[PDB]
């Protein structure tokens, strides 16, 4: 039922095994949807949707691809050059995420967060390096050093606050026929692993819904069964979602219960499934 901003972000996952070996994984996402892939071997962007280039011309797309190719190349070489000085022990890993998100009010917020060992390392606020407390002395050292490279900071500032917001608005409009659609879920009931001797687990499966906000609850007519355990909203390959809502009940206190499903695509016709 919960919903946040609509964001476009590029992610990076770099594994530094030894001083001569490093591997980077990168992709481009519009929320949970992958719109970009990166072929690390050829050093090119893979457009996974016909609208993945947004409203950006073939020249501007080839310029950004070149920026990211030089970056992915340079990043592993620069970390391996600076690891000695930063006192890095092999093996270690790095993660990065950068992009921008549209909020209610037309306010687009741009972001860039880095990680070291799955822990926060840095963030970008007002085109500036903000070291994370988790990063330690290493994050403070990283931010104090990266400032000295004005060309890098300028390129990061252009990308985050100029290229991104207009790329986002362009990709949202270019893919509105895919982004702006209603897909109805299907719902079924089953029985789950016994939570005890005189206990039952009633499972309610909800699948094939788009967009992501959903409401699922076990009911006794109109009586909301408060002990309903809500699972995670899991993906389906076909840009739909899966969710299962369970309920632990005594053998007899399950006789008159049902499952009610609320979704934006159902046009007010909630799915109700009686236990039976």
């Amino acid at each position, epitope marked *: 039922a919960f919903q946040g901003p609509t964001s476009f972000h590029v992610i990076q996952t770099s594994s530094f095994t030894n001083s001569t070996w490093a591997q980077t994984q990168g992709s481009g996402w519009l929320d949970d949807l992958q719109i970009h892939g990166w072929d690390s071997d050829s050093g090119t962007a893979i457009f996974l949707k016909p609208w993945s280039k947004g409203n950006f011309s073939d020249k501007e797309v080839a310029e950004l691809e070149e920026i990211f190719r030089v970056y992915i190349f340079g990043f592993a070489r*620069e970390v391996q*050059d600076f690891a000695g000085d930063f006192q890095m022990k092999y093996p270690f890993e790095i993660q990065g995420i950068a992009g921008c998100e549209l909020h209610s009010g037309g306010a687009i917020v741009s972001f860039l967060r880095g990680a070291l060992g799955g822990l926060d390392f840095l963030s970008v606020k007002n085109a500036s390096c903000v070291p994370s407390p988790e990063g330690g002395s290493r994050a403070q050292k990283f931010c104090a050093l990266i400032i000295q490279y004005q*060309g890098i900071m300028e390129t990061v500032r252009i990308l985050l606050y100029e290229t991104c917001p207009r790329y986002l608005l362009g990709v949202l409009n270019a893919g509105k026929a895919d982004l702006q659609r209603q897909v109805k879920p299907e719902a079924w009931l089953s029985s789950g692993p016994s939570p005890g001797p005189g206990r039952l687990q009633l499972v309610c499966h909800v699948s094939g819904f788009y967009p992501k906000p959903v409401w699922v609850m076990w009911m006794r007519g109109e009586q909301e069964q408060q002990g309903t355990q809500l699972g995670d909203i899991l993906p389906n390959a076909n840009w739909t979602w899966y969710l299962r809502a369970t309920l632990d009940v005594a053998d007899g206190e399950a006789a008159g219960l049902s499952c009610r499903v609320k979704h934006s695509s159902l046009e007010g016709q909630d799915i109700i499934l009686y236990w039976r």
Partner: T-cell receptor
Amino acid sequence: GNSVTQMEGPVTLSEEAFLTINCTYTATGYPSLFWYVQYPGEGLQLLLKATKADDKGSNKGFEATYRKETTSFHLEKGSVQVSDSAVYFCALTPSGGYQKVTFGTGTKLQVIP
Amino acid sequence: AGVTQTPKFRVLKTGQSMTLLCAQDMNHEYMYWYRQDPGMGLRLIHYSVGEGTTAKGEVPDGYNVSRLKKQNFLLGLESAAPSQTSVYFCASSMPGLRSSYEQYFGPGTRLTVTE
């Protein structure tokens, strides 16, 4: 859309004269600046460089300060030697050296004894 | 011994083919092929950002390149023309923020294409 603009043509100077080879550039960003020297019958070689604005390159009596405001990298020497007879190329590349270098046409220096 | 070039000098008939070899045992990632003519200055033909990768420069027509091994940058002339009469210089560099990323040039190769 980078460019390098250096001194128009050949420059003849007597031994121990003050040398000035003007160089200005046009670039977007924070590029690095270089001076390459090409001796007769030889290839080009770095004379000096200044990786960031206000840096000062110094080699073989020659010097050049990277002035971002006047978008310049003027070459200077207090007392030119006869061995300074060469072509001087002003150069530019984005910082990091991950992209191509932009050279000026080169200035010929003739130090007469 | 830094950047070396073979041949040092060559005279070709129009239509004849040749290969210029450039080698560097400095472990440099980048390699470049230029030609130098009076009044024109240095003009890039082709360049390589790493072993297996090549790209076109300012004056690439009439020339082909290859980077099979990181050490060498091969420049080819498939059909020599009199316009290809020039002094050819190879350069190599090592990118990196702390690297001494200047270009290192070879001695030159004089080529003359006669009818």
